Write a protein that binds this DNA or RNA. Sequence first.
DNA 1: ATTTTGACGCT
Length: 430
Amino acid sequence: GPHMATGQDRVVALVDMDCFFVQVEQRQNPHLRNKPCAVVQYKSWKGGGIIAVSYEARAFGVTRSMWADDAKKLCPDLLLAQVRESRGKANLTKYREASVEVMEIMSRFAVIERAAIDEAYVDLTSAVQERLQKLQGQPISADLLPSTYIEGLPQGPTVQKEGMRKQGLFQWLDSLQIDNLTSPDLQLTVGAVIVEEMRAAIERETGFQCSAGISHNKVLAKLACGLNKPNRQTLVSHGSVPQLFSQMPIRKIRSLGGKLGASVIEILGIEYMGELTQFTESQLQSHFGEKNGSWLYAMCRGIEHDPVKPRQLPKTIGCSKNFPGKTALATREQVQWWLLQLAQELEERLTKDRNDNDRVATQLVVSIRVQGDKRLSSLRRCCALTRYDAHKMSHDAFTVIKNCNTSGIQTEWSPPLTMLFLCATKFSAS
DNA sequence: ATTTTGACGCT
Ligand SMILES: [Mg+2]
Ligand SMILES: [Mg+2]
Ligand SMILES: [Mg+2]
């Protein structure tokens, strides 16, 4: 009891831009605003592959990883914006630059960890301490939390969505003990006030709306963020965890959506995160390894210690192209031309990175796939990156892969290549 | 024939 650590030491937020690439295109083209629309890359094969979907289009069943032609079957009025194509390939620069806009706003409020192009974790512990001092024991008004849900409320003894939201927030604020500055529930509540202000700043200064989760760690913040989308934020308190986890499929927790979570389900014969509490830490370690076992033992109790890392910039700058079916590169000239295209985009992005961020990549990673291999990568080789020169980088990549050609013939490349990937890594200050 | 990314853990 008195020594049971409860994982209530931090306030952590996860901010997730709503249907991000779609909003970028809708800001640029007002005709797309408030319409079923999607972002598609390429157009020739089946109308293009959808990679982002507005909530209006999601209502028709349109999803990511859908061909545009099939999406149009579900949603005949679906509007489409195409990813830019440069040097023969999709180019995501517009979305990377929009991401920078949002990340730089978030960084004015607190230390952020860039988790993906459209999401960042925020460590709000210190900001919450400061705001609690500025308030002077003053109660927190519902008006400070106009888009916040309290997960698990209302409970106990209106039929509209905003009405339920307000009833739950009222119950929460009515229970709060605002005079105890060390109360974790109060700390989370102030965190949510700050996140309201952060999301308001993002929308005012970029036009982009986002959702957010506020809790005591990254996994719960991420889970909370998805509970009320779009354009809303959700507070998941420590006390809400038992009910929340009692019917939460294991695959919904970050890192359990794949083979490990499937093994948890199969080996333990359970379905819901909360069912994990009935195993000892040693039992979970025995099935899933020392680190996974300890992590699961604490996580099913709502506890995790993974820090919000101070990293606003990506650690790698990469570019890749698949060559599916019959487009597979079967000649040396082909391989060299496409290595050059990838290397030129990489050089452009690298030079911009060096100017903006005072750093230089030192390693070039080359990865290829050969036809007939279920693995995403068939071969991954590194070499030195000493000069931001596209021709040199393409030559080096060719040098490190050229012995993969099993063909005895001079030009022909066998087996044909279905993927090329150049990645700049190992940055150093400059 | 989703494609094009990005981070991290294992050995
Ligand atoms: Mg996201
Ligand atoms: Mg998103
Ligand atoms: Mg998504």
